[PDB]
Design a protein around this ligand. Structure first.
Ligand SMILES: *C[C@@H](NCc1c(COP(=O)(O)O)cnc(C)c1O)C(=O)O
Ligand SMILES: *C[C@@H](NCc1c(COP(=O)(O)O)cnc(C)c1O)C(=O)O
Ligand SMILES: [Mg+2]
Ligand SMILES: [Mg+2]
Lengths: 319, 319
């Protein structure tokens, strides 16, 4: 596999500049005092469509030629890449078919349809969504734009970390949410450019620690779909492109419980005044767990997204 | 009364630069499409202590001399000015006594105490908090720093609008939440400097439309404490300094129902991913109600604060 490099992240910044949001970086006095450090939060929950995914989607679709754009694209996603592709596709006038899990947050499915995406569903725990994707794409002549295991997609996700480092400088540690590895691999490429000798940490829900196992083992570990409220991290295994990069440019993979995610979600709401979906709480939850190692350092936290069903969010806040 | 001018808002920017947050401005594609306009949201819910109040508090306390700082300050507040004064006072080593309503959000009372403020309570609907303030201050030799009816306080609140105009330019209309009039009067001073011929609108909860009545009548109208979820706008009447300015530099005062505030709060959470307290939803709620007048214009919305009890917020999101 020909792996993308920081050069691809840099070019991605150019391709998305026209429509993507240069999301703000927030800080918290409470957090800094508790951690005895300087923590910076990159708010991708404020990105177009509510998650970092718009970056990878636009970067990928922008590189399709005229014929490919007219023919249409297909993708499979837990929900955010789905919305990202739908929005990017609308902007570029590209027809888009999207395969989503039946138990995906209603808000993510609704938004995808609202953007003009044609949605087909699958069972997250029993079906092989990639098998479905291949067949539908092969049968309808559609270009598949994977949710993470693709050079253009992962390179694009890396622009969030790129922007963070350009705004606050190199950081001793960067915490990143981990599902298939697109956000983490892209972030790692940017991290090694701006802070080659610092730390990059991926974080998965404990029930879905396939990435952590792969990292320790040296090969991709496959697990049954994990049951966790982190709906954007229920992947069965890491992508091939992403793992290739993660294995080389990531220092460690951590895990946190759903209980910890909920406490983090409440903290974000009560102390930082921002809405973050469970999956977007992985990074901060892990940072809190290892705060002792972060004393007197500068830390970067990626808030990956904020797309949740309000009713469910209200439920979490009530725990 | 010697009314403050934009010059005082400009100087206030200098006095708070050391500790205040230059809060971000957010935009929403959904909002722009619905309004057929460009709307800009000044996020004071991201200000130090979660509300715009830190601005006026720091501006006022920073202008107290050595003897006044050592002697201590006293204030009365629904909760946000309380926290703002407590925090500012801690920064400057000033002892602070704060009178708060017994039914104020627990989070606002807790934060005030956490900042070192000595809290005394009053009944929001039956007591005369200013009578209490005068006596305690006269008896203990404390300098009173009112929550809105003071030149330094209102001038400081105006720095939020100042920053908004400096970032996005003059705006056709600016919507501002209205309680005692500090935020509105300060905002109006900044507005008339950057956009002298544009529109400035104040917004009160319908049950507490004393400000609207005063604006129409030409004199201060007094009402019994209104029952509304907008806990930072339950004032019985406008301040004297604030009304003097509002009467001259504000175009109209609008009102919205609690039902409209709740719908706005849910919108902020679901579509913009931010936590906003009921009172901070007044401005946007009113803008939505008069969207027809906003077509093809540029609008400014002040998100005044985000301090709410999580349990209560979750309750609102569930409506
Ligand atoms: C791609 C997938 N979304 C994932 C997601 C992550 C994890 O990203 P990676 O899968 O490793 O690239 C972290 N936070 C959030 C909020 C989301 O959605 C999809 O939507 O298809
Ligand atoms: C001063 C008072 N807080 C009020 C408040 C307003 C209204 O401000 P004005 O009273 O007119 O200056 C709007 N939004 C929020 C969130 C708050 O708190 C206090 O806290 O004492
Ligand atoms: Mg996993
Ligand atoms: Mg009123």
């Amino acid at each position: 596999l020909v792996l993308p490099t920081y050069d691809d992240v840099a070019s991605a910044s150019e391709r998305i500049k026209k429509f993507a949001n240069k999301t703000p970086v927030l800080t918290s006095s409470t957090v800094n005092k508790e951690f005895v450090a300087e923590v910076f939060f990159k708010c991708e929950n404020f990105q177009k469509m509510g998650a970092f995914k718009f970056r990878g989607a636009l970067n990928a679709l922008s590189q399709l030629n005229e014929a490919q754009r007219k023919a249409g694209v297909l993708t499979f996603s837990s929900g955010n890449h789905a919305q990202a592709i739908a929005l990017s596709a609308k902007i570029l006038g590209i027809p888009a078919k999207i395969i989503m899990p039946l138990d995906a947050p209603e808000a993510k499915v609704a938004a995808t349809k609202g953007y003009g995406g044609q949605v087909i569903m699958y069972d997250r725990y029993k079906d092989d969504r990639e098998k479905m994707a291949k067949e539908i794409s092969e049968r309808e002549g559609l270009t598949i734009i994977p949710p993470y295991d693709h050079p253009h997609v992962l390179a694009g996700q890396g622009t969030a970390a790129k922007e963070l480092f350009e705004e606050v400088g190199p950081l001793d540690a960067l915490f990143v949410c981990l599902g298939g590895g697109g956000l983490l691999s892209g972030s790692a490429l940017a991290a090694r450019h701006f802070a080659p000798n610092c730390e990059v940490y991926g974080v998965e829900p404990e029930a879905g620690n396939d990435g952590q196992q792969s990292f320790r083992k040296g090969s991709i570990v496959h697990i049954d779909t994990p049951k966790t409220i982190a709906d954007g991290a229920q992947t069965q295994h890491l992508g091939n492109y992403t793992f290739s990069i993660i294995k080389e440019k990531v220092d460690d993979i951590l895990t946190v419980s759903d209980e910890e995610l909920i406490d983090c979600l409440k903290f974000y709401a009560a102390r930082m005044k921002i809405v973050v979906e469970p999956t977007g709480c992985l990074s901060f939850a892990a940072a809190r767990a290892m705060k002792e190692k972060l004393k007197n350092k500068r830390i970067g936290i990626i808030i990956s997204g904020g797309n949740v069903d309000i009713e469910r969010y209200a439920h979490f806040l009530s725990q």
